[PDB]
Amino acid sequence: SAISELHGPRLLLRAWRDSDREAFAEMCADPQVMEFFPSVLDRAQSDALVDRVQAHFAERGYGPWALELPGEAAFIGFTGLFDVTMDVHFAPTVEIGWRLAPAYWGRGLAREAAETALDFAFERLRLPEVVAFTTPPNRRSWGLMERLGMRRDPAEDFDHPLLAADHPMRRHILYRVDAARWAER
Numbered sequence: 001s002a003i004s005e006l007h008g009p010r011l012l013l014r015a016w017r018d019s020d021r022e023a024f025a026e027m028c029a030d031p032q033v034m035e036f037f038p039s040v041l042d043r044a045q046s047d048a049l050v051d052r053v054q055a056h057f058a059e060r061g062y063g064p065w066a067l068e069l070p071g072e073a074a075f076i077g078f079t080g081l082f083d084v085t086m087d088v089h090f091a092p093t094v095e096i097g098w099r100l101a102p103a104y105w106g107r108g109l110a111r112e113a114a115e116t117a118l119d120f121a122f123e124r125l126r127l128p129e130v131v132a133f134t135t136p137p138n139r140r141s142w143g144l145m146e147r148l149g150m151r152r153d154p155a156e157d158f159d160h161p162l163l164a165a166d167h168p169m170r171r172h173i174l175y176r177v178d179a180a181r182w183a184e185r
Ligand SMILES: CC(C)(COP(=O)(O)OP(=O)(O)OC[C@H]1O[C@@H](n2cnc3c(N)ncnc32)[C@H](O)[C@@H]1OP(=O)(O)O)[C@@H](O)C(=O)NCCC(=O)NCCS
Pocket: 032, 033, 034, 036, 097, 098, 099, 100, 101, 104, 105, 106, 107, 108, 109, 110, 111, 112, 133, 134, 135, 138, 140, 141, 144, 147
């Protein structure tokens, strides 16, 4: 396979390692990290998530990269691209998502990771568009989407189809950025 690593000024976006699973599990168990998600995850659930990531990298050659901070930390979380195949109005497409350990918030690291992942999406993969979705309360998350230059149509708000019809977290907002908008920043 030989999954290609992506480099920013500060960040290394790399394939996941066994050593990552411990660090990622405490992130998944952190109520500040998982605040706008349905719940925190146990070790088994966190490992399942990593298995899905590795399987995504095996099939597609890209995925949510593990974020390394050379000269500081081996693992501060993930940022990158996931294929959207679920039954939503904007499928099929590619989504960008991110999760940082709280110690690394407020540093522009999610921004830098996301810019590196989108550079890849538009320059190497040459995708027409990348989406991002989150819940309205998760201001840190859609705050990053709009600072990245992604734009929301409130009319494109949707109920996540892999949650229950009456799930309290069901309502998601959609941000989009196309090759043209990304190149124009
Ligand atoms: C969503 C999340 C990744 C955002 O991370 P973040 O660190 O807030 O985002 P950025 O990398 O853009 O950093 C922005 C902050 O750094 C500051 N900053 C400092 N130096 C900066 C730099 N060089 N570049 C950019 N921002 C910089 C900005 O002013 C801003 O400060 P503020 O948040 O207090 O206003 C993070 O809150 C998180 O992991 N949350 C939990 C997981 C989650 O919900 N993910 C979304 C799933 S839908």
